[PDB]
Design a protein around this ligand. Structure first.
Ligand SMILES: Nc1ncnc2c1ncn2[C@@H]1O[C@H](COP(=O)(O)OP(=O)(O)NP(=O)(O)O)[C@@H](O)[C@H]1O
Ligand SMILES: Nc1ncnc2c1ncn2[C@@H]1O[C@H](COP(=O)(O)OP(=O)(O)NP(=O)(O)O)[C@@H](O)[C@H]1O
Lengths: 926, 471, 157
């Protein structure tokens, strides 16, 4: 901050800053630093694609750099960069140590060549190369490096068990334990254990080596491998330790030439090929998967076929699964699992090849129906097949009522009963055109293409509903709340039937819903609320009448819509069985069985009597509430039809679980700050109030006046509004040059401890970036500066408003054509590298996740469209939105969609002309 | 035609049919045969991506196949498939011959390992590896294969000129001439000379090696390289013989440690990086282009930047041509050719990145106008830029008559006069909306946005026409 | 080459007098070009066409049917045509000019340009070489399309 910017003293505080970011472990902070004015040599500038997804050109650049084997620096970074994306066979076959003799005696200052090579020789091992090479490296007189002695002793344990002496094996394993316990271990307070992973990875592998080095027979052996499968359960899905541990297992059971060691060998070759497919670097998947291809594993053949199908090679993928499945109709080879799976993958390759359509896959599809009935992700995959087919049939014209969608609904609700994977994404796949054919029933009386089909498919929904789990229905419950109109009446009867199911089973989670149910002023809700109350009290579980207490809370919360002033009213309903409207009522656990699909019950005990209303010209009576544990959670009233915010909330609360399912997002610990919102009546709803409600408007008004930045306070809108488009940029530059870049001066006051400050800056960048581009993906607009929400606990950012969507700044007056909301005064506070950092990586991983399953996101945003809010945002406009979600550029192709679309959003938000060409109610520098 | 279709007798008349299509040389006829019911083993079915544009997965599949180095078939096809898409550094660094000793004495029935390795050792050479490895392979008692003796004698000529004895070099070159004239050559009537290319490629390289092995001084040397540039004119643009001949040239002038041999080295590293960019396998472009990057060639930096721009890497492409051009305003480094070219490529990368639009490239665009006026594919490239810009402006509405398309026509008809490359594709680029503004003149009388502009741009077409070539 | 470039132009109505074959060297060409831009579909006797391909060509192309240097020629042809198609767009601007046609419009020429770029039938994920080659091949080999057209275009001839 305080220096000449272009100056000689910068470069050393660039280079030690990047070596302390090697210490910090944030590889993308390192990336932003190497890309932000660190541009000395070209061989200094080619260390960025190293981590920018293109490591192959970096690696063969470094191996032609260091190939003369004399320079220290280039050759050390050659072996290290060659290490860091797992070309380990090429490390061990590299003849920088192999020659007419062994390696270099009296291992020089570039001993880290060895110290990076011995570990690759461990995790891909044999007898002879490990043997002669560590017996070359024993010929050192001294062994000063810790890591070479570490990997030496684990290698000598490996050759000891090649010689089959497990007590000497444990001797060297315990020696390695001594080395790490005495020489490697750093403390707490300093390390998110990403930096510890290089230690605990190797020690996990070492102990896993150790106790089944200390195994006796095959019963013990299969037991050891079963609890190694438990280790592979508890590892999560982090690729480098995954790869490391099971490749070390692979090295050991190819060391051991026992025959069940060979079976374990083949299956672990298979499984590391599986994770290499999962993490999409399928050359190592091939070079591992070969050793189980040649040992006659047809499932390994099928997933060799799937890596070929994944990359570019539709043709022989089709052809080899063709010859394998249509050859395999011999002895069982289990038909319901193996043959069902390979014919399933065959059928969806005929989908995504799209050349030999339905009837050819209809025959083997009914073969799938015959050979398997206990495994339903077949049915989900053919459900998305028929999603594609109904979209193709509707793509030419509005011709409906095919048997294909009827059968699609039928097996799909059958599939609901079995595993529950895509159900919580794809309940719209039944109900959307189920209610569309209900709309056809009200539309047209030719069109007796519905009636008997409607009765039969409603009977399918009935037999789904009497057998279904209760908890899966709540995932579309607001659209189930959005079902009011007649002309079917049996969809109404069955949605009241699922209200009865979800009311009798789990009554606690539906209290606010069954009371917001009948709350309107154009109340046709009297029937659909009072009659379900009659039927629930007709059902035998009614010990307590908290229904009327919830009605009293609702009439109080709508009485306080106008209690103005410019509270200590009625209470003692708390304590009750009223479970709190915090998301710690409604969050859903991942399925890890028996289990329970909800949080534990957080009821109410106390009621706050003091008012804490703002002066926001409508004055929301927001309350401070003490829960069942005793903690304080702010619960707000809200006005003016807060339903679309619940809709965006439901999109966000499927988005975050998709972020959890992403093993790249929450690998970097992604995720959004989020709250709870419900609609209760018209112009009356509920809100959660976040810990540390603050915004950039309020607290930057305080910060610029703490620096006493005196300005044209409420006359800048006059002297910019009377100003035309010519001086708009002029007065904008005048403003933003008067106002200094500050926000780090507020962050350092927020966080004394730079632990909290820097992890809050990471949380800040990520939690701002994700919500920020997802908003403009939704077409949000009008992001006034009261809408940034920032906790002072950890800096997590969220947009909360969502009260305007789908071009409400452009085709609305005061034309507000927006890139998206970004403040230029965020950029210094994000770091030295401006916005060019973990912001950008979060953007990359966010887009990579969102364009994996966007058709489920399309099913979610179908619920949005529903323009009681909007004038002419149409179904085709939703398809245009879907095109934008896919990657359809502004009438352009060549869609990179990750780095290109990230650069698109970044370098459209940094366009200062767009920053000037919008209204200073959205003053951008705040 | 006349058989049972599903029958046992088909498979042998599949496999000899595919070996006679190896004889026929039509690699895609081979491809159709291997993809049309030749589906025995998976290791028989993974020889199709070999020629179906994905050779890398095929190659590391074959090198993990043959890595145990005992089977004849898998290891021979390992080295051959590894050869057939030019991983020659990996061939020569492959330790199927390198060990604690040299290679296998009494070269067995898989001597085609050697016979495919010595040629890669030729076209990427040094002193010591060529030296000790062909002096390993001399220790055979008999040398029954023709091709191993061919590549042996061209390698011994290379070590003879490492020892700097050109008469003994020509002795072995003429020995290699004797080998091909006595043992390789087939006739006419039977060969579209694609099949002869494996012979005439090597002999072209061998003679090009030969007469400037028989060179005396630098005047003779630059003359030899100038008529080698004539050879590179008459080669056409067939990638494998291109690569082979100039990489052999590269091997020889890195053998010769003379300083103009090093200048010739650097520029031939540059040019094979150029053809590797042209044929789009830019890992070999990088691994060649390095040896002239480290010898301070900024045009090689710029086209390293263009292989990075080509692949996936807009960002540092922009950034390194940014730092190089906006650093290069020193002594001339010719402004009208080199600096004009690098700023031109900078400007169209700002086009195809599309983030820092017109005015930022308008300033350096007029800088291009200042520094160069004799070279017009700048003007064609900014003509297609304004094609994109007029399409973008018309993409929102039918608003015409901008000064940008007027100037576009103006320099574009100026560009017509100079080189005539995109003219015969893009005469519509002037006349289409020239006659559209004529249609605006008949359409609408607001729309006095045409008249004086129409007269001025018609005067531009007039001064194009009095100076233009007729044809 | 001529076969897929015709349907790229949207040719249609390839009656069997239009194949031209020299007995000197077997070079093929379509010559007619007297009908373009959906003159089989929105014209009576609806003639929705993949493009002209005769199934009796496939044995004569070789043992491998149509799956060969046909396919490689298709790959290299598409790889060339989607390098400089904006110059090809400048050429086909001259076509539009519908004194011949009723309502083939400028926006219809942009739709044609989208087809030339690789815009699928309302789909993305455009491989545009092996995928589009397989698209043309496995739409021409669809026997239902071979039956669903008029036998004045008798397809087996
Ligand atoms: N659900 C929420 N969670 C946390 N903070 C919120 C929430 N809703 C609003 N706020 C905060 O409340 C502050 C006061 O504004 P608020 O009364 O909530 O709306 P408002 O000021 O009336 N917007 P407007 O209707 O345009 O005047 C805002 O600056 C937000 O930071
Ligand atoms: N330009 C040409 N070059 C070579 N052969 C041609 C050419 N034009 C037509 N033919 C051939 O002439 C043959 C006789 O038909 P032709 O008289 O040319 O048109 P046509 O039979 O009248 N078509 P139509 O108008 O529908 O009856 C055709 O089968 C073509 O093979």
């Amino acid at each position: 901050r305080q220096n000449p910017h272009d100056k000689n003293q910068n470069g050393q505080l660039l280079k030690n800053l990047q070596i302390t970011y090697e210490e910090i472990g944030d590889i993308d902070s390192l990336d932003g630093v190497l890309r932000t004015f660190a541009t000395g040599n070209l061989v200094s500038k080619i260390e960025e694609l190293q981590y920018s997804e293109n490591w192959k050109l970096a690696q063969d650049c470094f191996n032609v750099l260091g190939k003369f084997s004399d320079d220290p620096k280039t050759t050390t970074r050659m072996l290290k960069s060659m290490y860091d994306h797992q070309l380990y066979s090429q490390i061990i076959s590299n003849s920088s140590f192999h020659s007419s003799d062994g390696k270099i005696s009296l291992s020089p200052d570039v001993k880290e060549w060895y110290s990076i090579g011995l570990e690759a020789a461990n995790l891909e091992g044999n007898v002879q190369t490990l043997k002669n090479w560590v017996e070359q490296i024993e010929s050192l007189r001294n062994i000063d490096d810790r890591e070479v002695l570490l990997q030496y002793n684990i290698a000598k344990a490996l050759i000891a068990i090649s010689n089959e002496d497990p007590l000497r094996t444990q001797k060297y394993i315990h020696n390695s334990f001594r080395l790490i316990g005495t020489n490697f271990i750093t403390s707490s307070k300093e390390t998110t254990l990403l930096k510890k992973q290089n230690l605990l990875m190797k020690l996990h592998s070492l102990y896993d080596l150790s106790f089944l080095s200390s195994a006796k027979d095959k019963f013990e052996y299969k037991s050891n491998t079963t609890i190694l499968d438990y280790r592979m359960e508890r590892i999560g899905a982090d690729f480098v330790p995954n790869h490391y541990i099971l490749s070390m297992r692979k090295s050991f059971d190819q060391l051991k030439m026992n025959e069940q060691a060979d079976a374990d060998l083949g299956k672990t070759f298979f499984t590391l090929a599986q994770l290499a497919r999962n993490n999409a670097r399928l050359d190592i998947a091939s070079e591992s998967l070969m050793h189980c291809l040649e040992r006659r594993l047809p499932q390994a053949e099928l997933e060799f076929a799937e890596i070929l199908w994944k990359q570019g090679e539709n043709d022989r993928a089709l052809k080899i699964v063709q010859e394998i499945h249509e050859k395999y109709q011999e002895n069982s080879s289990v038909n319901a699992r193996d043959r069902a799976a390979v014919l399933l993958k065959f059928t969806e390759w005929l989908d995504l090849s799209n050349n030999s359509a339905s009837e050819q896959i209809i025959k083997q599809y009914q073969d799938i129906f015959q050979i398997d009935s206990k495994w339903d992700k077949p049915y989900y995959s053919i459900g998305l097949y028929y999603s594609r087919l109904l979209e193709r049939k509707k793509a030419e014209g509005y011709i409906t009522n095919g048997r294909f969608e009827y059968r699609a609904i039928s097996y799909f609700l059958l599939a609901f009963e079995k595993n529950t994977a895509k159900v919580r994404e794809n309940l719209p796949k039944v109900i959307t055109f189920w209610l569309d054919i209900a709309a056809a029933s009200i539309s047209e009386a030719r069109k007796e293409m519905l009636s008997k089909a409607t009765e039969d498919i409603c009977s399918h929904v009935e037999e789904a509903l009497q057998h279904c789990p209760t908890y899966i229905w709540y995932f579309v419950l607001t659209q189930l709340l959005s079902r009011l109109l007649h002309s079917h009446q049996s969809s109404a009867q069955i949605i009241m039937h699922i209200l009865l199911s979800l009311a009798v089973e789990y009554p606690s989670h539906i209290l606010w819903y069954i009371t917001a149910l009948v709350n309107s002023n154009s109340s046709k809700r009297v029937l659909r609320g009072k009659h379900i109350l009659e039927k629930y009290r007709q059902h035998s579980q009614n010990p307590h009448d908290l229904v009327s207490s919830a009605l009293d809370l609702t009439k109080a919360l709508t009485r306080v819509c106008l209690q103005d002033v410019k509270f200590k009213f009625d209470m003692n309903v708390a304590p009750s069985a009223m479970v709190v409207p915090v998301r710690k009522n409604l969050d859903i656990i991942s399925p890890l069985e028996g289990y329970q699909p909800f949080r534990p019950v957080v009821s109410i005990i106390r009621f706050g009597s003091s008012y804490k209303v703002f002066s926001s010209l409508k004055k929301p009576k927001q309350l401070n509430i003490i829960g069942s544990d005793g903690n304080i959670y702010g619960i707000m009233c809200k006005k003016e039809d807060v339903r679309q915010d619940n809709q965006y909330m439901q999109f966000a609360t499927t988005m975050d679980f998709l972020l959890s399912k992403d093993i790249a997002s929450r690998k970097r610990s992604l995720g959004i700050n989020i709250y709870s919102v419900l609609s209760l009546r018209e112009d009356c709803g509920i809100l959660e109030m976040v810990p540390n409600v603050v915004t950039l408007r309020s607290i930057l008004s305080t910060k610029y006046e703490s620096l006493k930045i005196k300005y044209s306070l409420k006359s800048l809108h006059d002297r910019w509004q009377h100003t035309a488009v010519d001086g708009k940029l002029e007065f904008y530059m005048e403003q933003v040059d008067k106002f200094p870049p500050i926000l780090y001066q507020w962050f350092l006051e927020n966080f004394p401890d730079p632990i909290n400050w820097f992890n809050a800056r990471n949380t800040y960048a990520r939690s701002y970036a994700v919500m920020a581009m997802v908003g403009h993906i939704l077409g949000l607009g009008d992001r006034h500066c009261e809408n940034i929400l920032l906790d002072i606990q950890t800096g997590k950012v969220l947009h909360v408003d969502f009260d305007c969507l789908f071009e409400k700044g452009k085709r609305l007056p005061v034309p507000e054509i927006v890139p998206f909301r970004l403040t230029p005064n965020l950029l210094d506070a994000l770091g030295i590298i401006g916005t060019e950092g973990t912001f950008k990586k979060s953007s990359e991983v966010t887009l990579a996740l969102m364009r994996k399953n966007e058709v489920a996101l399309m099913n979610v945003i179908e619920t949005i469209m529903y323009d009681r809010n909007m004038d002419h945002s149409i179904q085709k406009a939703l398809k245009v939105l879907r095109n934008k979600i896919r990657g359809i550029d502004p009438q352009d192709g060549l869609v990179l969609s990750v780095a290109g679309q990230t650069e698109t959003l970044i370098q459209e938000a940094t366009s200062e002309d767009n920053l000037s060409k919008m209204y200073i109610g959205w003053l951008p520098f705040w």
